[PDB]
Amino acid sequence: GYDRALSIFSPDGHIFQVEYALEAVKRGTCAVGVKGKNCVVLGCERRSTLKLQDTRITPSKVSKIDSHVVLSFSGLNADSRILIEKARVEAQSHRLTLEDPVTVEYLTRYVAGVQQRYTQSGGVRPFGVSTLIAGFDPRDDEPKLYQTEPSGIYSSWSAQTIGRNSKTVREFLEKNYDRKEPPATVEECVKLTVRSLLEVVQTGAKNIEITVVKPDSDIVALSSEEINQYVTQIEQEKQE
Amino acid sequence: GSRRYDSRTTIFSPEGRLYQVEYALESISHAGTAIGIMASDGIVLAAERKVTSTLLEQDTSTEKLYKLNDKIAVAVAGLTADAEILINTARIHAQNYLKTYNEDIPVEILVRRLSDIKQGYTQHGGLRPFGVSFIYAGYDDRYGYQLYTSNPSGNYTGWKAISVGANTSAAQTLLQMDYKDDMKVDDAIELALKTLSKTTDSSALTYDRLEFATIRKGANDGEVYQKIFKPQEIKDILVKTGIT
Amino acid sequence: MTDRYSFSLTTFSPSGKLGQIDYALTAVKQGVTSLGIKATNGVVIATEKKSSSPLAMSETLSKVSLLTPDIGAVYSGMGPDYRVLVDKSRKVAHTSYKRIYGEYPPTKLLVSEVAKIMQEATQSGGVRPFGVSLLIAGHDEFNGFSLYQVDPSGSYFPWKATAIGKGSVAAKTFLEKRWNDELELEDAIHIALLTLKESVEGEFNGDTIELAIIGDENPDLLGYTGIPTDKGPRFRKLTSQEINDRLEAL
Amino acid sequence: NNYDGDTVTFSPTGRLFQVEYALEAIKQGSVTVGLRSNTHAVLVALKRNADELSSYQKKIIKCDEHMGLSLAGLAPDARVLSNYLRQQCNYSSLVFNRKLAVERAGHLLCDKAQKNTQSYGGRPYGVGLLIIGYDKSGAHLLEFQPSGNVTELYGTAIGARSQGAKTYLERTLDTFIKIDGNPDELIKAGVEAISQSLRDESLTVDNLSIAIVGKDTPFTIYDGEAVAKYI
Amino acid sequence: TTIAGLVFQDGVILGADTRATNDSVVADKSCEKIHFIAPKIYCCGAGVAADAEAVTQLIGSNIELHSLYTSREPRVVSALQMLKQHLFKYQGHIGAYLIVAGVDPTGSHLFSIHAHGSTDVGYYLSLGSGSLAAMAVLESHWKQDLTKEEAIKLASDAIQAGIWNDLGSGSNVDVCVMEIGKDAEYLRNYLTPNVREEKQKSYKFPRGTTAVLKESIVNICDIQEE
Amino acid sequence: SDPSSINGGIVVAMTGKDCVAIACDLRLGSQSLGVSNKFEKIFHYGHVFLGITGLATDVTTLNEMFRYKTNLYKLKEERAIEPETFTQLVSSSLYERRFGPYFVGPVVAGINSKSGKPFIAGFDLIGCIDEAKDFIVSGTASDQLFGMCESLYEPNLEPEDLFETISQALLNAADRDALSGWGAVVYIIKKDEVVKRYLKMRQD
Amino acid sequence: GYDRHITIFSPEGRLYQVEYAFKATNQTNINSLAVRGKDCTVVISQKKVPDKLLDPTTVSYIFCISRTIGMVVNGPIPDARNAALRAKAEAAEFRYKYGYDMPCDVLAKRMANLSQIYTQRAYMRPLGVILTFVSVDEELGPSIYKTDPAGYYVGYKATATGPKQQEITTNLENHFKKSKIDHINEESWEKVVEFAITHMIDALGTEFSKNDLEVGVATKDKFFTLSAENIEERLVAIAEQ
Amino acid sequence: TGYDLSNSVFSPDGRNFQVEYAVKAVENGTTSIGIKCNDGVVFAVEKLITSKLLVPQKNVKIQVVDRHIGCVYSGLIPDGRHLVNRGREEAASFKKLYKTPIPIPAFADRLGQYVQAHTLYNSVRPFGVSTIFGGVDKNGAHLYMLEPSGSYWGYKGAATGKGRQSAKAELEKLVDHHPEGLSAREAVKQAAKIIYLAHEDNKEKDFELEISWCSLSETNGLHKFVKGDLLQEAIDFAQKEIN
Ligand SMILES: *[C@@H](CS(C)(=O)=O)[C@H](Cc1ccc(CN)cc1)NC(=O)[C@H](CC(C)C)NC(=O)[C@H](CC(C)C)NC(=O)c1cnccn1
Ligand SMILES: [Cl-]
Ligand SMILES: [Mg+2]
Ligand SMILES: [Mg+2]
């Protein structure tokens, strides 16, 4: 087999392949995660360089891992599928042996562990993908939002963004998100997620995708018109 | 040892790009243009052959348009030999699905499988990626008519109309200009040929240069028919649309 | 004592070229001219027996090879690569076809299998591409007569007539002027011998030319009688005498 | 220069630079001394600390009841090679009811180290070992280099500043070889030898490490207040 | 089954009956037990029918490829060696009992091969359930320097002895003649001593005699097209 | 215990003038227990027909296998497989399982599209070919079918006479076998039309 | 310029490692010659024992591959022996599997196909040797078949190999231009050896003693090498006419 | 250039520079010799006494293979041991199958093919030893010498290492002055002399002589080391000749 050590240390103590994978994430379309009091919302950018697209069948940016946990990402699309597949397998394997669905923290830890394994295995390059993994634990009403990255580190976030111009939307969330009082309702959380994307997206509503996840496996994706109403209300308030 | 000679096909550049995928895409940009257009009552696949010689036996020739099963076809842009490896795999995946579930494989499942195979070559194994971009045209009872493309990176996306190979920038502008959602197969046939006719590096577009195919749910009694056009039938449709 | 070359030796350069394939095609260009012409009732393949020494017995070196009873092959480029490809082509005809279906494969499918083998040399670990272009002529019951070219890349195209190697550019122009869809096999052989004279410097006779045909069934060459269905091989290599006969009417 | 990228490459003058660089890791290692008489064989090792809070790195490893070694260089490599020795000593006991000969132990280490120098991907061992033992032909002392060269000696030293101890033993040769049936005096001669390789630092109670094997003496290691006697 | 092979002046000849049986019943009345291996090398097969057919076909494929590689006529000893080494490998589990005969540049040859991989050299041989009936005839009549006409007579007689007296054997006689310096001639249905006699009555039924519940047309074609 | 006679059932195929017929019963049982009266044993891949008797799981498995193989054949060859070629494929495929065989009795029937020649064949479970001119029988009442076919059959029957002969061969054989019957199907095959008929028979 | 280190194509379409393996062929500075009689095939080669400490009986570039096949090598002895051992193994394995002695030309083809694999696969280097196989084949009669590092092989009426091969080749070419036959029309092998030696003397322009030559002879059903005394008897006969 | 950086790469000359570099390691090593006598062989070697601390007679360099073959070598000592270990495996599997002990020419090729195999790939290094070996078989005595390339020949006398030119000249005299042959006990004495004469090239450090021998009459064809009185008789003879 091909055994070559592609991820290795450089004199300054950096693993360039892992850092260059982060550059692939920086190139990827913006993804944002905002957790409210009784919900999590996952926002995603869709670049409008590609029109004449078929949005029914095109791979959606947010993926269900089980009926109660979702995964969005920024970076290489083809790489993300491999992680999503492995996670979905592990989700059912956990149900089969533990007789209980995965926690969001467990699922994140597994995906993060896979990403890590590829940074010190022979013959493989790291995943050019950072993920946001969100949902609710079984029989639990506390929202969960985790982030992973090519190096294999993972951590929990009140709100987080990844991908291109994530610096700008993180700037926005850092000033607008209050921990002592998060978005109390679904509306407020979605609004703050749309607002944050509107800093970078620079176009109406086709370029924004929203997915709301609520407790007890209640996941729904918003349509163009539902999102477009949020966009309208935001800019009308802004004209003042 | 051997390390000295290893190109390291599966690495990132400092910018976070995959060298070999990018260079394979550059390879594909020189290949003959392939166009897929999806209508409400069918799909069109049109493609330009690359090697005009008068002595090429065109009627038995197949460089661009291949059949994957009775419901799904592909248009090829890039190295034909590479595409034929992938095609034979996709043909098997279809039949495995048919043997297991006793139902024809959904279009997206076949596309994802192939795209995942292409992805594998960019992430592990140290081999060069497949220098091939596909346009998948297909039908199933869930989503109906579907167009997809995959490229050497293993990324795939869905389309209403799309071009791969040469002059895709010029071709996609022209498609974006004249495509509409209520369009029909006969209109899409015309659009496909008009687009190739403007983007072609050749002096004129002729029948001996084209491969052409349609998937219609306009077979007898609500079935789906794949038609790979014979050379005479391409010549007829060129006269009909008014190009020659 | 390890094979450590598990990585591709053929890779994409910045311009989108596959260097090793292009260089393999350059090696094919330096190789001796061979050609193929398809008639209505047959196919002919031909090449020059470029003898490396006059002490060598050029009869022993078969540039034109039987693959199945109804399929033949000729090349331009590196002879040793061709020889091994012929060995694998003969075997793959049995293993992937005859032992399954109880009959020899059709021309296009055998060509497809050879093409596959050459493609794999263009992507597999630790190998260079094959430095040959093949011309494969053959017949089968449902496709009739056919002529295929197979390049180092693994790409193959069906031809009415073509040439490869040294003087292929000049030879293809010559074939374009002469070829039509009403040619009989004898006419194609005549045209083959004319075309091949242009690229040959020295002696031009049955001993310095190798020429075979895919034509009628040869029950005389079968070796046995008693099965009406088995009518004998369509492949036949022309003798040194048979070539010289046609050179008088040239 | 160009020929030092891996162990598989000879230089133009017939040198294996990766082996010579592994040899260099021994010289950077802390000094250790080996010496013997006809009845006993002794190891003395100067252990090294990282700083004043840290422990002193253990230099001596037991292989069997009648054999063991001291190390200088990469300690994980000494662990690998000692573990291999333990197994060979053990194999000899279990299968043949026979204690492994010290000379044969050296031969096994030599051949294990050699395989790493001729094959691609591997690296040489980055450690030198001084093996002592008492077998059916009396006391023995071996010096193992990771080039593969194993050498039977009366006495030697390896590590940083080892040349001072090695010159001392070369002078003392005729004296210490005769120290038969007296373990303490043989250890004294080893402690005096290792003192010739010291600069600035001196032999303290948790610094020094001594081991001994002999006629009616199993291989035992002395550390801490057990070596205060010899300071 | 009843197979035999014998040698004559400048050749070798093989014979076989044409009855294949499952248990006590006659599955086939006209099966070919003489198998092609090369143009001038043939094989009679008795034992398990599928095993005997399959083994000869495999060796025949490998013999062809070997012939192509070496640019030579294949030899009977090559077939013999390849058949026995394959049959030996499988320890009789490929239950094929063969008589291999042929002509090559060395001369004419006759060998028997048993299922366990043992081989015999002989001037006349017989195998299968009728071998004792056939061998009785060969032992009574075989002599040196037979003419081709005497050889075909004796071979067909040996097979006939099996056909009549052995229940396992029946129907017609197949013969193959391999002579030096000539094309091998394969003579299927050389004798036809067991044609069925005409029937007393014709059991063709009046149309509509069979009761039918439903009818339908089956679509066998690809796509009915617009 | 004997796999070929757990489930039961029969297939018979006959040649006629410019036509072939293949027929089968509809029973699937667990020894004495009848389970299904809609288990058809005759399939088709283009214009080539394959009847399969024996262990029902293998009948289903082989159908799915030959569909798979013939589909790939067609994509590569660009034409439907013929009966003679398919026969060899069936033999090949059965013999590759020589030492763990499919417990079946397959029967190929069809007309060669190029020559027009009627063709039938039968196999044992490990792939030995019986390429008969007259008829092929298979299943648990194969003895009964041999007896019926051998007396009832005559060569060069017209399609509508051949129907009567093959039907009466099947029906009267199945009524003398416990493990066959429960309905029956008869395909009459011509070069470019195929008629399928379900037969009325005693349901015990 | 790593296209010159392994067996891949240069921009010109050339395999520089194959070309340099051919140059290794002449490193021994030994010239070989093979010719065919009516009933035999004779191969002669120069024998140079430069060191007096060498046991001259162990210095040989001629190998008895099988009973029927002999093989002379032009090139360094380690590669010569590599090729010899393999050929022996192949010739034995052939006999076992297929029940008859491996023909000369088939062995040559087999060794050539092996040599081809070293030109295509990167981890294997070509052998720096030219193998000249000789036999009296039972079907083809007297046979000379030569393999090189490129994987090329062909039959010969006669052949010559080494630094001065062109001089020996042209000498032989001229003789067969006169006689107008494919062989040495001579009954006894003894005289065919005398021919071989004589025409090498003429081509190279050097005289030989018994210890300057090495001779191999193929007859029907055996190949054998001549001793120094057998060669001496040959040299005496040449000088006496 | 770059042709010398990888093993198994032909230079434009047709040379494998890595093998020639292995030869430099052999040339750098101590002097070892072999002498073929009437009914056997004699091996001898120069062992440089780097220090007084080396135990005399203990660091044995000559190695036996089977019971009838001796092996000595100059260069990288571990490489020599790896080759002898292989030789022992070869000699064992030969005897296991064929009963008879391995003949010396047969044994010679088993090493020759193995050493040659290490010049075929870039994943392995060539052997950094010339090996002088031999013994008595059913056909009589044999002496061989084997280089890093895998090249080997039979010899009357052989020599390798730093003092090889000096030794070779002395061996060439023995060959000229004794055409009828040399006895086993004579060869032991001459071997001692030749190692002493070849020590002028390694004259800085003093050395220790080590001799072994197989002889049909003197050892029953078995490999044995020269020990005690016979060794001292050879050392005395050698010491007398230098003075
Ligand atoms: C006669 C062999 S005997 C009884 O030992 O003399 C005959 C040889 C034969 C027949 C046909 C061909 C055609 N290729 C070649 C050789 N063999 C048979 O009749 C066998 C006899 C069996 C092994 C006892 N019959 C079979 O092999 C049949 C298949 C035939 C009808 C095609 N199968 C079985 O009898 C059988 C039984 N149980 C399980 C499977 N098969
Ligand atoms: Cl081969
Ligand atoms: Mg019933
Ligand atoms: Mg190479």
Q: Which residue has the tokens 């097979």?
A: E159
Q: How far apart are CA F152 and CA F154, in angstroms?
A: 7
**What is the sign, positive or negative, of the torsion defined by CA atoms of B18, B24, B30, B36?**
negative
What sections of F119-158 are H helices per DSSP? Answer: 142-152
Question: Domain range holding F198?
Answer: 1-204
Whose Cα sits closest to atom 17 in ligand 1? E49
Task: Tell whether ligand 1 has an atom less than 6 A from the beta carbon of residue E48.
Answer: yes
Question: Residues with Cβ < 8 Å from C17, sequence gap 6 or more?
Answer: B27
Is residue G195 within 8 A of residue G184, CB to CB? The reply is yes
For ligand 2, an ion, list residues with CB under 5 A: G 113
- Nearest ligand 1 atom to alpha carbon F123: 32
Question: Measured between beta carbons, which residues in chain H are less than 8 angstroms from residue C5?
Answer: none
* Cα E177 to ligand 1 centre (Å): 25
Is H136 within 8 Å of H40 (Cβ atoms)?
Answer: yes
Neighbours of chain F (3+ CB pairs under 8 A): B, C, E
Contact A1 C6 (CB under 8 A): yes
Domains: count for chain A: 1
Residue with tokens 């982030």: A147
Question: What pairs with residue H47 in β-bridges?
Answer: H208
**Shortest CA distance to G151 belongs to which of C200, H118, C113, C130?**
C130
Q: What is the CATH topology of the domain spanning B1-244?
A: Glutamine Phosphoribosylpyrophosphate, subunit 1, domain 1 (3.60.20)
Beta bridge partners of E212: F199
C99 with E58: Cβ contact below 8 A: yes
User: Most D CBs within 10 Å: which of H18, H53, H60, H79, as the mutation test of the D interface?
Assistant: H53
Q: Which helix (H) or strand (E) holds H243?
A: none
What CA–CA distance (Å, rounded) separates F48 from H25? 75
The answer to whether D190 touches D211, Cβ cutoff 8 Å, is no
Scan for tokens 């009761």, then name that residue: E211
Q: Is the dihedral of CA G122, G124, G126, G128 positive or negative?
A: positive
Per DSSP, the three-state class of A199 is coil
Write the residue with the smallest CA distance to atom 15 of ligand 1. Answer: E49
Tokens representing A208 are 């924004």
Q: Which residues contact A139 (CB under 8 A, 6 or more apart)?
A: none
Q: Are D74 and D127 in contact (CB under 8 A)?
A: yes
Helix (H, G, I), strand (E, B) or coil at H189: helix
Strand pairing category for B34-39 and B42-48: antiparallel
Longest dimension (CA), chain H: 56
What residue owns the CA closest to ligand 1's atom 26?
Answer: E49
Which atom of ligand 1 is found nearest the CA of E28? Answer: 31
Where residue E189 sits, what CATH number does that domain have? 3.60.20.10
For residue D166, the chain H residues in CB contact (below 8 A) are: 51, 53
Question: CB burial class (10 A; 0-12, 13-18, 19+) of residue G173?
Answer: middle
Buried b (16+ CB within 10 A) or exposed e, G175-186: ebeeeeeebbeb
DSSP per-residue letters across G168-229: HHHHHHHHHHHH-SSS---SSHHHHHHHHHHHHHHHHT----GGGEEEEEEETTEEEEPPHH
**CATH number, position G51:** 3.60.20.10
Please compute Rg for chain E using Cα positions: 21
∠ Cα D191 D195 D199 (to 5°)? 155
User: CA D125, CA D144: separation in Å to the nearest integer?
Assistant: 11
- The β-bridge partners of E174 are E16
G96 close contact with B: CB closer than 8 A: no
Please report where in the chains the tokens 């000729």 appear, as a residue.
C74
Interface test mutation site (partner B, options C1, C6, C7, C155, max chain B beta carbons within 10 A)? C7
Q: From CA D138, how far away is CA D180, in angstroms rounded?
A: 12
Q: Which residues of B touch E224 (CB under 8 A)?
A: 219-221, 223
SS3 F147: helix
CA pair distance E97, G56, nearest whole angstrom? 57
What is the total residue count of chain E? 226
- Number of Cβ within a 10 Å radius of residue E21: 16
Cα dihedral E43, E46, E50, E52 sign: negative
Q: Cα(H200)–Cα(H220) distance, rounded to whole angstroms? A: 35
Work out the end-to-end distance of chain H between its first and last CA atoms, rounded to an integer number of angstroms.
Answer: 50
Strands D32-36 and D40-46: antiparallel
Q: Please tell me the experimental approach by which this structure was elucidated.
A: X-ray
Q: How many CA atoms lie within 13 A of D88 on its CB side?
A: 21
For C10, residues 6+ apart whose C-beta sits below 8 A from its C-beta are B128, C18, C19, C20, C21, C122, C123, C128, C129
In the structure encoding, which two tokens stand for residue B140, read together? 């199933």
Q: Report how far residue B199's alpha carbon sits from residue B169's, in angstroms, rounded to the nearest whole number.
A: 9
In this structure, the number of other CB atoms found within 10 A of the CB of residue E10 comes to: 15
Q: Identify the chains in contact with D, defined as 3+ C-beta pairs within 8 A.
A: B, H
Give the Å distance between the CA of G117 and the centre of ligand 2.
10
Q: Does G17 touch chain H (CB under 8 A)?
A: yes
Distance CA D133, CA D144 (A): 14
Q: Are strands E184-191 and C224-225 parallel, antiparallel or unpaired?
A: parallel
Q: Does D18 touch chain H if contact means CB atoms closer than 8 Å? A: no
In whole angstroms, give the CA distance from residue A154 to residue A87.
Answer: 15
Please state, in angstroms and rounded to a whole number, the distance separating the CA atoms of residues A169 and H162. 75
Q: Which ligand is nearest to the CA of F26?
A: 3
Q: Domain total for chain D?
A: 1
Cα-based angle E12, E18, E21 (whole degrees, multiple of 5): 130
- Which residue range(s) make up the domain with A162? 1-240
Ligand 1 in reach of E168 Cβ (< 6 A): yes
Q: Is the CB of E21 under 6 A from ligand 1?
A: yes
Angle (CA) F31-F32-F33 rounded to 5° is: 95
Rounded to the nearest angstrom, the distance between the alpha carbon of F201 and the centre of ligand 3 is 9
Determine the residue among B15, B121, B124 to mutate to test chain A binding: the one whose Cβ has the most chain A Cβ atoms within 10 Å: B124
Torsions phi, psi for D221 (to 5 deg): -105, 140
Place of tokens 């019986």: F130
* Span from the CA of G114 to the centroid of ligand 2 (angstroms): 7
Q: Residue C29 phi/psi, 5° resolution?
A: -55, -45
For chain B, how many helices (H) and strands (E)?
6, 10
Asked if D7 is an interface residue toward chain H (Cβ–Cβ < 8 A), one would say: yes
Give the single-character DSSP code of G121.
B
Rounded to the nearest angstrom, the minimum Cα separation between C230 and chain B is 27
* Residues in chain D closer than 8 A to H85 (CB atoms): 111
**Contact between residue D89 and residue D54 where contact means Cβ atoms under 8 Å apart:** no
CA distances from residue C204 to C62, C172, C201 in whole angstroms, order as listed: 17, 20, 8
Q: Reduced to 3 states, what is the DSSP secondary structure of residue C43?
A: strand
CA dihedral H67, H68, H74, H80 (to 10 degrees): -40
Identify whether the C-beta of residue H133 lies closer than 8 Å to the C-beta of residue H72.
yes
User: For residue D52, what are the contacts with CB-CB under 8 A and spacing of at least 6?
Assistant: none
Helix (H, G, I), strand (E, B) or coil at F77: helix
Max alpha carbon distance in chain B (Å)? Answer: 65
The whole-angstrom distance between B4's CA and the closest CA on chain D is 11
Q: Which amino acid is at A108?
A: T
Q: What angle do CA F167, F172, F176 make, to 5 degrees?
A: 145
Which residues of chain G are within 8 Å of residue B4 when distances are taken between CB atoms?
Answer: 2
* Site of tokens 């003798």: C239
- Cα separation, C83 vs G150, whole angstroms: 12
Query: Going by CA atoms, what residue is nearest to atom 1 of ligand 1?
Result: E1
Atom of ligand 1 nearest to the CA of E20: 19
Structure tokens at A51: 């029109």
Neighbours of chain E (3+ CB pairs under 8 A): B, C, F, G
Q: How many residues does chain G have?
A: 241
Place of tokens 């009296």: G136
C-alpha distance from residue E167 to each of A65, A172, E3, E170 (Å): 70, 97, 14, 7
Q: Please, which residues bridge with residue E96 across strands?
A: E47
Return the CATH number at H75.
3.60.20.10
* Residue D145 near residue D125, CB atoms below 8 Å: no
Cβ–Cβ contact G109 with E under 8 A: yes
CA angle (G54 as vertex; G53, G57 as ends), nearest 5: 140
Measured from the Cα of E23, ligand 1's closest atom is 35
Domain range for E152:
1-226
List the alpha helices (DSSP H) in chain D: 17-28, 75-96, 102-118, 162-176, 183-194
Give the whole-angstrom CA distance, residue D137 versus residue D144.
Answer: 20
Please tell me the total count of domains within chain E: 1
Residue G159: phi and psi, rounded to 5, are -155, 165
Q: Which run of H or E residues covers position F158?
A: none
Contact criterion met (CB < 8 Å) for G57 and H154? yes
What is the three-state SS of C75-99?
EEECHHHHHHHHHHHHHHHHHHHHH
Domains of chain C: 1-250 (3.60.20.10)
Query: Any alpha helices (H) in B102-145, and if so which ranges?
Result: 107-123
Residue E1 is among the residues annotated as catalytic for this protein: yes
Between the alpha carbon of residue D114 and those of residues D147, D200, H47, the distances in Å are: 7, 37, 20
Q: Which of D88, D108, D142 is nearest to H58 (CA)?
A: D142
Residue C105, phi then psi, degrees to nearest 5: -70, 155
Resolution in A: 3.4
| Whole-angstrom distance, CA of residue E212 vs CA of residue F200 | 5
CB count, 10 Å around CB of G29?
11
For residue G23, the number of C-alpha atoms closer than 13 Å in the C-beta half-sphere is 12
| Number of helical H runs and strand E runs in chain E | 4, 13
Q: How many domains, in total, are found in chain H? A: 1
CB H122 within 8 A of CB B2: yes
H125, closest residue in chain D (CA to CA)? D8
> What is the distance in A from the centroid of ligand 2 to the CA of G40?
27
Helix or strand run (H / E) with residue B76: strand B72-78
Distance CA B75, CA B84 (A): 11
Closest ligand by atom to G114 CA: 2
DSSP state letters, B36-56:
EEEETTEEEEEEE-S---TTB
Cβ-Cβ contacts under 8 Å for B73 (sequence gap 6 or more): B45, B65, B66, B67, B136, B137, B138, B213, B215, B226, B228
Burial of residue E207, with CB atoms counted within 10 A of its CB: 0-12 exposed, 13-18 middle, 19 or more buried: exposed
Contacts of G236 (CB under 8 A, 6+ apart): none
Question: How far is ligand 1, taken at its centre, from the CA of residue E35, in Å?
Answer: 15
Q: Answer yes or no: is the C-beta of E11 below 6 A from any ligand 1 atom.
A: no
Number of domains forming the structure of chain F: 1
- Domain extent for G130: 1-241
**DSSP, res A52:** S
Q: Which residues of C fall within a CB distance of 8 Å from B54? A: 176
Let me know how many helices (H) and strands (E) chain D has, helices first: 5, 10
Question: Can you give the residue range of the structural domain that contains H126?
Answer: 1-243
Nearest CB to E184 within list C98, C99, C223: C223
Return the amino acid letter for E26. Answer: V
How many Cα atoms sit within 13 Å of C208 on the Cβ side?
18
Residue of B nearest to H2 (CA): B4
CB proximity F166 to E under 8 Å: no
Report whether residue F130 contacts ligand 1, using a CB cutoff of 6 Å. Answer: yes
Pairwise CA distance, residues F199 & G4, whole Å: 79
Distance, in Å, from the CA atom of C31 to the CA atom of C21, rounded to the nearest integer, reads: 15
For a ligand 1 pocket test, name from E19, E42, E48 the mutation site with the most ligand atoms within 8 angstroms of its C-beta. Answer: E48
Determine the number of helices (DSSP H) and then strands (DSSP E) in chain H: 6, 10
Of H54, H81, H125, the CB nearest to D111: H81
Burial label, B180 (beta-carbon count in 10 A; 0-12, 13-18, 19+): exposed
- Residue C155's SS3 state is coil
